[PDB]
């Protein structure tokens, strides 16, 4: 909905957003939204996501797909009303995204999802990319385990010519919806194929907000494979504007750079990671500042 | 409708337009359209805006969506007639924009919406863009608070990978319609996606006129993300063409340039703005 | 319809076309077509114009829209037959343009619409463009008043972010149809937005002939805004082939160049205009030859 | 249909094709096909042409449109069968082009349509183009009158911002069908607009064969207006492959070059024309060899 | 269908393919498929080819179009099954190409279609193209007569602005299907338009295999009209890829180069041709 | 489905994946999946593949096409449910790919399919390409026989202007489905034509995963024919991201380079092959290390 502000209310918002990343306890936001979801009336639609065609499928708090649901409206303080209606397995009325309020009026945050090696990591979407020798697959799995901490991380596999890999986009969005409804740390191996169908386009522009709202982190690998300037720019765009955080390889082997957006209008931070391989290519992340928008695009032409 | 003129009537129009920006009391136009809107019968369609598909949804004076409305025509002096029909949640007959006359025959204005730091600002749409380090988000919020003055400003959020951000275009136009119906100062953070679906195209070419007619100001940030090349001249200009006013960053950090169209065929004015950050990235616009 | 000729009949046609611009009394053609329109059977379709979708709406001699009209045919001397049928507010049979004969066999003319400052101006469409400091809006209004002479000129406003401006294409074609049915001098402020939907394309290629046939003049402003070579060429094309006359700014402030097509196969003439601003930006046009096709395109790359 | 040949039958065909242009009496082929058309059963479909949408309308020998016609088949010596069926004003079964045999087994000709100034001119389609000062409109009218000789020539007007000009494509194909059914010499002023909808594409690739089959000549003006390489190549293509003859302007004022295809597999001939203007821009063509395919494209880059 | 192989069966296949071009009697493959086609029940679908829209029409062994045909399946050794159903003039079930087995398990051949001037020519599709003065039309007709030998050659005319030329794609595929069903040597003058509608795309990718299976040769002229730039390498190559053989003009007038694919995985042969004109532009191919 | 991991479970997965290629007995994975397929309830859908239009056809364990099958669901441990429904010969509910679990939780492998000349070869898809004199057809047949070993290899022929070649895409996917259901070693001669319709696009992104899951190898030839940078990049993409292994020609006659992905996140290996021709062009492969991602793209510009 829309929000109204004056100098005072705005200043409070910024302070709260700042705290959501810098001081709140890592993962507390995720736990809180888990609570909100559990308190739902059962059978109540909570998440809508687009399939290949552009239509949307809906799920309940238990990641179970809803096939039929009679029109129902809800009026917010905004005075605005939201309507949800599912017919024959597809949304007839409503919008893509969370169908239940998880954020209240605390919007524009990058809720801290975890802490590792002395650094705080944001929830939302993290694209792991770059052009070079450093492999993205080992990195996403190492980051998943590290941010998972005490918890296991969920792995969504898509579009790779390996055994057991799903290659159907609609099964893909199904795996993603379930993962965000049930886990704090999610790894998507290969944003390839996607990034174009309406579903792929919707996913690319929806996933970050969905994840940040839940307080979970989606770690997706993306190889700037094709050097075709039409998609090379689609990679730099996805990385630039559709990601909450970015993890890119450097010219030094095993070294990665992490660029993270700490919140609406807040500063973008950066830190470095060193890594090394163990047996069977298992990667380990070793454990022992702002970057202008100009320095940011300097990082972007790396993908070019 | 169409208007007829001779040298005399034209001269009067130009004088009236000039006054609408230069001498009228800041925000008086908004108050006047508020009065007109309040006089509508309730359930009577007042605003129609396009959704993603190109279809249009309709609202009453209370920002309530109209699902069903039997055909109804209205004849003007122009001799022309307007018709409005809503069926199953979508407009069957009518046009996009205000469905009620707010402007009378005073058209082609950039009604003054506020005065700040010694400068008068126009209503309509204001695009804040440019390439560089100066952040657009802090600027639109600072501008919203300053132009809001004694009133709070409304914030419409869209398309950013942050918590609580709506990314569905249809919810977006809904937020925008409600905002223009109820507030004088509106901030849209991120005109992404738009600038393309038919809805996005309709929005870009309708919003400025809708806002100027109401007397409200829509302050929208637009990052020339697509490319970092001096293609920033692309979205710009295209911005300058569908905007009542333009606010672009300069090569000096914290400094911005304001270019404003004072009216139909009138002079385009320009002034500079100096700014600085406080705690938690709150931006402040200096005033002489 | 089609016309047959031999050396003699052709020579007569050219002489008549030449007179329609050079010797006829300014505005006489308009008065004549006004007469033909008034003699129509009432309720009889006289004008058809395309809406955004590509369909067409129809009007009667009083600029009133026709919603229902049973099939009716008419056979010309050409032996050919025209049919008109309106159903549910849209043309079911017929063509875009004038549905009644206003020109007889006198075709291919640029009927003189007015005289001012010692120059004759043609009816049809006039595009006012150019890239520079000189503003198009003040010029179109000054030209409207001047060519209007004793009569007022009509103003159609479209697609500008100012108060009271219509931005819906279908309302636009409605204003245009009514203007051409009722006035001799018409100003269209902003051909922007248009110039692409089927309606916009139809309008661009129909309006000049519609206006020239009626004997009215449509003065439209067009800023070569975007420097995107795909539409910059659409501007040079519209100006080159879809305009009866062209008014372009020069490198000297306040100075404009008028290029006018005097008729089918006739010479394109050119003259200059000097202007100055009064109070509230009101512009005034001060009052005190052929141009090859090569010199013509030299004028075109100005827009490039 | 398909034709079978051996050395002897092939040699006869070539001799006959050669005669159809070089020795037959000018205009005799037209007279012959007029005879074939007059002997048709009345109400019998003879010509089908595509409208904007891609559908086709049908006409009888009197240029009258056929709205309903029950399925009817005809078996040729080829063993193949042709079927024609019109329903609700549109062809339901059949093909675009002549629906009646006018050529017999004498195919691949460029029937001489007329003789003037000591040169034989071919029937089929003639595109008058080139980039320069020389005007196409005066040239097509002068060529129409000259080739018309004792007969008047028909003029089809389309897409120009002048009085009385039709701008609706469907009315345009209607005028063309009627013209080819009733006259030997036809002038089309402005192939602009066309040259893209399915109808425009069909017209461009059908008209030459339709005209050559009838023995009539269609003289069409085409300005290489837009210097947009996507249509500049569409102009060089239309001129190169869709025209029976080409008439292009040169770098010398008033001079034109005529390139004509004399028949299937035969030599392309070329000759020059000198012209001058009289009163009211009436143009006159004054009256007192093979060109390789290489020299031909050298003529083409003139349009580029 | 799919075929299985081991070193031995594969070696035999390659030997058979080699013989199909190098040692078999010229034209024997055509005669053999003629025999097979003649053995079909009549009214039984044998050929399916695509029309402009992408749909397909069906013909019997007599080149008669099949309007209605109730479903009927056939199981092979492969275990796979083929189905054919025609409804209202169009194929409802089936595939494009030959609907009857002509080749047996001898696949991947370029069956010799004729011998002339000391060279063996392959059946299948032959594209005649290139940039330059040498005219394609006279060459395809001369080649048709020479390969026809004792038999006349069939000529399919399409898309040229000359008298009696069909310009409707659907009539075109009809002429082509009939030609391949009834003749060994076919000439197509102008593969215009094609090289795009679905029908044109299907034609380009089907015709070569259809012709090679039958044992007939389709000689098509293709003018790289679109552009005169060295883009003649575009249509070419693309020609070389969908053609069994290529005939391209050289920089010496009257001289042409013949590139022919002798079979699946076999060597591509090349030889030169000298030619000259007689009366009325009749072209003659010199023979040593 | 999605899988959860912690350091320990992840390490076990990597060890198992490593073994699936390096130590398991060549072809054992294929034999195992053959077993799983034979245990299916008969008439039970096991494979779905896309046809030209984008729709999908379904097969049973005997490579027989399923035309009708009433909705049936299955719940996995993931909690997620899969549904399959076939109506009128096309899938109404379900996804493309294997409709039965063949991999269990052992995902992301490149199951060894065979061993030859001292090298292990992976299952999945192998694209044989490169630009040069070395012919792809003789190489795919030699590799088919070699990897086939004691078993015969299956050959799918498509889109070549030779006798007996199918050129209809839908018959093509039918041959491929049957081949993967019944044989370990498959050769596809010509991925030309494909690599664009929805079916072609689906095939390109599905086949590798389908094959790796079954444990069979699909050896496909692909000539980088057209030097049109829009498809030349589609070739480098298909080779780079849609292949489990790549076999490319070098600048030395008869020599080829084999690049193989050994598993999810594992190292890409490379070795060389020497070959020579016998009689009738029968090719023989003579029988007597990691390559960075940088060296990998250096191999890619060969196709450019």
UniProtKB/TrEMBL annotation, chains A, C, D, F:
Residue numbers binding ADP 1:
133-137, 223, 268, 277, 281
- Where does the chain bind Mg(2+) 2? 137, 160, 189
UniProt: Mg(2+) 3 binding residues? 137, 189
Q: Which GO terms describe its molecular function?
A: ATP binding; metal ion binding
Q: Which Pfam families match?
A: NTPase_P4
Which amino acid positions bind ATP 2, per UniProt? 136-137, 277, 281
GO BP, sorted A to Z: viral genome packaging
Q: Which residues form a coiled coil?
A: none
Q: What is this protein called?
A: NTPase P4
Q: Which residues bind Mg(2+) 1?
A: 137
